[PDB]
Amino acid sequence: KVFERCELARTLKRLGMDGYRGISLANWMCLAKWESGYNTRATNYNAGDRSTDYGIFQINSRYWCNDGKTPGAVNAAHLSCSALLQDNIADAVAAAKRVVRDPQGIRAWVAWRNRCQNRDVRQYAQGCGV
Numbered sequence: 001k002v003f004e005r006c007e008l009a010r011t012l013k014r015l016g017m018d019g020y021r022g023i024s025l026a027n028w029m030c031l032a033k034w035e036s037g038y039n040t041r042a043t044n045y046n047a048g049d050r051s052t053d054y055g056i057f058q059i060n061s062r063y064w065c066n067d068g069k070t071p072g073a074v075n076a077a078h079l080s081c082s083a084l085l086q087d088n089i090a091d092a093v094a095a096a097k098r099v100v101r102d103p104q105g106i107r108a109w110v111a112w113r114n115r116c117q118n119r120d121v122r123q124y125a126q127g128c129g130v
Contacts (some may be wrong), residue, residue, distance in 0.1 A: 006127065013025055020097055021097075025125050026126075027116060034116070039056065041055070043054065056089055057092055059077070064077040064098065065083070076099075083095075086101075
C-alpha cells in the first residue's frame, strides 16, 4: 500500500509516534518519505553486506527483523520481516519504536541525517489535522 501523506500522518499519531523518544511526527514523516515514499511493500537488498531493508521504514534484517537469509543476524524487535510488508503498519511502527529505543535514536537511519536532520520538516505533516 502506498499511503497518501495526511492519511499516514493521522495513522502515525493514532499509533503513538508523535514525540516518541523525543521524535516529532514531522520527523517520522520525513523518514518514511525518503526511505520508501510511504510504500509498505518497499524492499531493498544491500548487495554489500547481504541484508535487506523492509517496508515503509526500511527496517534492516540484520538487527531488527528475521528473514532467515541474512548472515550474522539477530532479532532485537523479534519479528518476521514479512510482517513489515503488510498494509497494516502496526508491526512496522512497533519495530521503528524499538529501533529508536537504542542510544542512536532516529540517527540510526542515514537517510534521516542526509535529508531531515537540521532542516524545516513542517511541510511533511502540515495541513493534515494532527
